Structure formats: C-alpha cells, structure tokens
Design a binder for this molecule. Structure first.
Ligand SMILES: *[C@@H]1O[C@H](CO)[C@@H](O[C@@H]2O[C@H](CO)[C@@H](O)[C@H](O)[C@H]2NC(C)=O)[C@H](O)[C@H]1NC(C)=O
Ligand SMILES: *[C@@H]1O[C@H](CO)[C@@H](O)[C@H](O)[C@H]1NC(C)=O
Length: 430
C-alpha cells in the first residue's frame, strides 16, 4: 500500500521509562501509531474508496498486486475519529467514536520504526484502569513478532510501513487484514469487515487481556516465530474452519485467576479491586538467569495502593503454582481436557525464540464478533457444565458481549494505560 495524502499522519506522543535498577529510570519519548486496518484506504490519484463497506472496488483493485500499487492508507485523526488521546506517560482508548469501534496501536521508536523489546530476563510493568470496561470488552496490551519496519524492506509495494501501522501478525493468523506482505487481500475476499485467502502469523505474548471482571496472561507460540504468510483454512485461528490446522497455538497456555479457581482475587471490590487503578508487573525468567537462556517461567505481581500482591496459586486439582512454566501448562491442559497445541508448537522454548527475535508492543480495545469475549469473562463452551474445571472464567452471563449490544449500551467505555516501565528483573518496582 501507498502512503496517503488526504489526511496527514501525526503520531500521538507517549513517554515510557527504561530502568537499570529500582528508582533509576530514564524517560523515552515514544509515540503510537494506528494499525493499518482502521484507516481509510483511498486511490493514490484522487480521493476515492478502494475499499467500500465490506467490498473491494474492482476498478482499482482487480487483483492483490494492482490494488496495492493503486491504493493508499490515509492518515488518522486520532482524537476525533478513533477516540485515541495521550497526555504524558498515559494513553486513553475510547470504545465507540462516531461509527468507529475500538483501536489497535503500536509503540514507535521513531516515526518509521516500531520499538523492539527483547523480553528475555526482563520485566515489563504498566498501570491500568479497567474500571470502565464491562463484560464483552477486551483492553489488551501484548507483544507480537512483527518486523520493526512494518515490512517495508521485504516488500517493495509496501511504501507506507510502520508510519501507517503496517505489518500486523498474531497467533490467530488473521485473515481480516486488507494488506499483507505488500499486497491487498482481494482475491478470495469473502464479505461478512471481511476475510480473505491470506493471513499473517506470528508468535504472540498476551501480557494482559482484561476488563473489570476477568484477566488472562497467555503465551501463544508458532513454528516460525516472526511474521509469516498463510493461506486458506491452513491458517487456522479464529477465522478458518479448523482452529488447529495452522502453525500457531490459537489457545495458548493461559492463567486467568478465576478459571484457575480463585474467584475472590480479581474483580470489583476484590483483592485486586478493579474499580480503581492498579499496576501489572510481568517477569520473563530464563533457566540460567541470563539474557541468552531458555524462557522457563513467566511471573506476575500486581500493585494496588503501594501493596505488592502476587498472582494467586492455582486451586485446580493437580495443577500447582502461580506462574506459567512447562509443568504448569502440561498439567492445566490435562485437567481441563483441552488439546495441548501449546506443546505441539514448541511451548515456552519457542515463545522464547520469538522473544529473541524482538517483539512489538500492541495496545488495543476490541469487542468480539465470534465468541462475545466469553472465553475471557463467562462460561465459555456455553453448552457445558459450569462446575467442571475450566469452563468458568468470570461472572458475566452467557448472553453478554454481543457487539451490537455493548456498542450501543456502553459507547463511552474506555481503557487507560500509563507509566510503562521496562528493565531487568526487580528494576520497575520495589
Ligand atoms: C485467592 O488468592 C488470595 C491471594 O493469594 C488468597 O489469599 C491469600 O492467602 C494466603 C494463604 O494461602 C495468605 O497468606 C495471604 O495473605 C492471602 N492474601 C490476601 C491478601 O488475602 C486466597 O486464599 C485465595 N482464595 C481462595 C478462594 O482460595
Ligand atoms: C527479585 O526479587 C525477588 C524478591 O522480591 C527474588 O525472589 C528474586 O531473587 C529477585 N531476582 C533477582 C535476579 O534479583
């Protein structure tokens, strides 16, 4: 895709901090950029839609390649069209703005380059306010193995790049992306938004997926860490027919404290009381305590009112601990009767390989047209006994979360992420 000219692209500023030790942090002047898929795509020569509603305009987009040469991703009015505002070290995502629903943003090193995080033997921490996120919404902060330049050096027809939020991929191998690898997704485009023949896969570390009711932390490995194209139902993921047909783990190894049997830990009025802000800390430990080692454990702490509170232990029979490890992941898949696609695609060793490639920080607010976010905050397989281990993930009713409901009833929902800090283990807090 080309770079557009109707609207100029100005990235909202966002500061964060890199630390070397507790109390010793340096502020970085970052910025964020809106993902390519939320943008208006217009023809390079005038101001005409290449994409109209849920369909490609064949005059400009008769095939994948031509479309990409003829069409441009426009700049974004962040506040007014997409409901994104930044202040200093804080970023606010509004749910519904006019006819826009939600957003996905990446953190930039500079105006053409995603910030790369190498997470092994490091810790990542951020403050969050999810008090205005009801059932059916997902305020996500996570990492994917995208190219720093958004694909430009690999794909000559991508002239927009990171500056326009190109190059997305995650463990679902999404086929709803209008542009992949410097080509439009037009041949095979089946309207619902819509899905095409091509998808974009890469390893995904979901540090935080949450609303005011439930949260989960979930690594999702892929055979190839790092961005790959797939095609048809071989993609697997949410949009393909068979979830488990592809090269990535679509479920992942998850720790949601509610699902693990502690229902008094996280929620309104609870130990982590989601009516107020709190701090989320995630450590990525290696077997030998060094930066070159194998990923072996993911640990979680929360901080609310200067109190440091560790992730609760699993209270599921035969599943032990409060951290993600190979042992935990094996035991939890068995005790819930879920297919162990995690270990099939290389588990934590392969999550670690992706972390070694470097990963991009994504911040997001979305609702779920496929599954109503019930996998996160309700009884998920809905046709199943909510007393059997692993079905119940939160207190939301099973009729919650349908997009046309939440978009109409809670349009002023929002999420705020702030005070991002990154460094060696135990440097981001006391
Ligand atoms: C849910 O998790 C909480 C937090 O871990 C548990 O409360 C802790 O219990 C331990 C004993 O196992 C105490 O030493 C801590 O001081 C407790 N923390 C707080 C702040 O309460 C709680 O027991 C768990 N509840 C259930 C339902 O199992
Ligand atoms: C981090 O601090 C914790 C105690 O809060 C301790 O278990 C651990 O050894 C520390 N890690 C390092 C490498 O300093």
């Amino acid at each position: 895709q080309q770079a557009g000219t109707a609207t100029a692209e100005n990235h909202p500023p966002l500061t964060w901090q890199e630390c070397t030790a507790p109390g010793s942090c340096t502020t970085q002047n970052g910025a964020v950029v809106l993902d390519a898929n939320w943008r208006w795509v217009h023809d390079v020569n005038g101001y005409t839609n290449c994409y109209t509603g849920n369909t490609w305009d064949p005059t400009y987009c008769p095939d994948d390649e031509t479309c990409a040469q003829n069409c441009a991703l426009d700049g974004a009015d962040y506040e007014g069209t997409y409901g994104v505002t930044s202040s200093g070290s804080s970023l606010k995502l509004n749910f519904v703005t006019g006819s826009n629903v939600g957003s996905r943003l990446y953190l930039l090193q500079d105006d053409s380059t995603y910030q790369i995080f190498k997470l092994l033997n490091r810790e990542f921490s951020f403050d969050v306010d999810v008090s205005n996120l009801p059932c059916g919404l997902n305020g996500a902060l996570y990492f994917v193995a995208m190219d720093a330049d958004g694909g430009v050096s690999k794909y000559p027809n991508n002239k927009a790049g990171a500056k326009y939020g190109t190059g997305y991929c995650d463990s679902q191998c999404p086929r709803d992306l209008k542009f992949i690898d410097g080509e439009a997704n037009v041949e095979g485009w089946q309207p619902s938004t819509g899905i095409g023949d091509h998808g974009s896969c890469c390893a995904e570390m979901d540090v935080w997926e949450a609303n005011s009711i439930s949260n989960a932390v979930t690594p999702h490995p892929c055979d190839t860490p790092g961005q790959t194209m797939c095609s048809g139902d071989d993609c697997g993921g949410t949009y393909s027919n068979d979830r488990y047909a592809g090269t990535c783990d679509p479920d992942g190894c998850d720790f949601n404290p509610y699902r693990m049997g502690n229902t008094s830990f996280y929620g309104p009025g609870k130990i982590i009381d989601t009516t107020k802000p709190f701090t989320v800390v995630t450590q990525f430990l290696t077997d030998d305590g060094t930066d070159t080692g194998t990923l072996s454990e993911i640990k979680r702490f929360y901080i609310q009112n200067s109190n440091v509170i560790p992730q609760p232990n699993s209270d599921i029979s035969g599943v032990t601990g409060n951290s993600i490890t190979t042992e935990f992941c094996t035991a939890q898949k068995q005790a819930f009767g879920d297919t162990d696609d995690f270990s099939q695609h290389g588990g934590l060793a392969k999550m670690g390989a992706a972390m070694q490639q470097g990963m991009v920080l994504v911040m997001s607010l979305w609702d779920d047209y496929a599954a109503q976010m019930l996998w996160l905050d309700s009884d998920y397989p809905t046709d199943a006994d909510p007393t059997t281990p692993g079905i119940a993930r939160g207190t939301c009713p099973t009729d919650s979360g349908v997009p046309s409901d939440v978009e109409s009833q809670s349009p002023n929902s929002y999420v705020t992420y702030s005070n991002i800090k990154f460094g060696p283990i135990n440097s981001t807090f006391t």
